[PDB]
Amino acid sequence: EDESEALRQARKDAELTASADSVRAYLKQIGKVALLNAEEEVELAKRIEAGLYATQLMTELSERGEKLPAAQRRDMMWICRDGDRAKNHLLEANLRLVVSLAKRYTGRGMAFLDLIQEGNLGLIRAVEKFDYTKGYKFSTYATWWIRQAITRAMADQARTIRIPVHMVEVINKLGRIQRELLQDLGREPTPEELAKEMDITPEKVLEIQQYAREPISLDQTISQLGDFIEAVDAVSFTLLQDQLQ
Template structure:
């Protein structure tokens, strides 16, 4: 995968004549590469003689964008929460770092990390007090450098968190900033100043990844696990790329072929990414009508919104299945299930059931009558009558004595009595 990403980036560089670090990290994120793999790609590009252009105003914040101190202060008045406004004001007062300062802080951080590893690896009792003091001093210096590097780039997190792609995620700006800050701190831990890149461009990948993870974790009413969210995001990215190339909607087969997955798997992943819509969402031209008010008719059952009714209906279905299995034979249970539509099945006619069981219509009727008579005379059915007092499941409960469709036709003609001859 690293070699493929490197080849694609080389093709882009040969076509356009330039390449940025953000281009590299963006493609790496779409392909699902880890941070270590990103560094391998950067080393491969450097070996191929590719010089990365670090100028990317919309992502690589250099202090001269739309988030300078004056604009942040003007935006504070429109921020709803005072704490967020105070945070933005404080972040705007922190001076930006020069490239030399970033390199110096990065080296101090790495020295502190090496000292911490050395102190943990060595025998504490064997370390002299003077050496221990030097270790602790270097570690503390690294922690201070880490705080300074993170603090100086807080506005970078704000600039990324306010991008439109994240504004539509359903996560509040303050939460997006919080997620981005965790990515920024992770970037400060992993930053290698010897590679020669600005910290802001390197940190952009970590910040975006952290905000994406936060959106996947809290941006949906039904949470998706991280690996499922990443899969859905990858499929959506490939789908958008193919549709842009083909200039038409892409089929599941084409999408599965590009991803190297089965068609059913791709369809399932696309289903995961479908948004969850609330019944209370406002719709219409003026957005003043709840969606629930527009859902009516036989296709929508309002009782499904009542949690108590749903639980009661599920319990009834469970108890009914238990009683039927205890009292009737498996074939009789199957006949009643198809005949009365139990468990959500479609109601079938006697002829249809006969075709499924390979018996005659009359035999199906006999099985039905026998099963109903058995239920009427068995005491195990008594536990089901308690559901009759709850009106929430009147439409769910189907008594064996009250089928959903017309009762079987009566016999034609009078029943002959033995020993009697009709007039």
């Protein structure tokens, strides 16, 4: 029952609830926003670039330039604002897609919403460098940039012990090869198998495994571990100085 009214008044009253779940909340924050049309996105990008050129032209002519006409100034300011609002609307449309691709790295390392926001940043960079001259789907180009951003952020913020990005790369490579090697052979692959696989001496795998180790919170139970973690020499040093005296 659509225009049953009551049936939509209930929906409106349900829209105004407290709700404490942030993932549900953001699910509804993009809830209000809708999808986008490819050609509509093309026009959106066109307006974005136009407003950008307009603002930079303002900045260039701001120094030793010209007293621009009131109508010309008004229209160009409006184009710039239109471009800003166009990119805001475009990002609003893309939040759904970025959320949908960010749900695939959950359950590990960091918060799902954290993944969402890092993906949003990747999306901003994607629109920052989107080329529609060929006129292809925006999402297909975007996925690479969002995945780039979220993988970067995961690497930079994964562990309490900071490891360089190159090392994140070699570690997840090591894990993937380990997994597939077990899947094929079924026997634990020896470190020498990995050493020859990557063409390295029999040490890199050991160091990379040691880096891959996750720290164990001193908080534990069985009672936390922190309690159970560790005057002859002090007295001796004072005595030896006196003995020199």
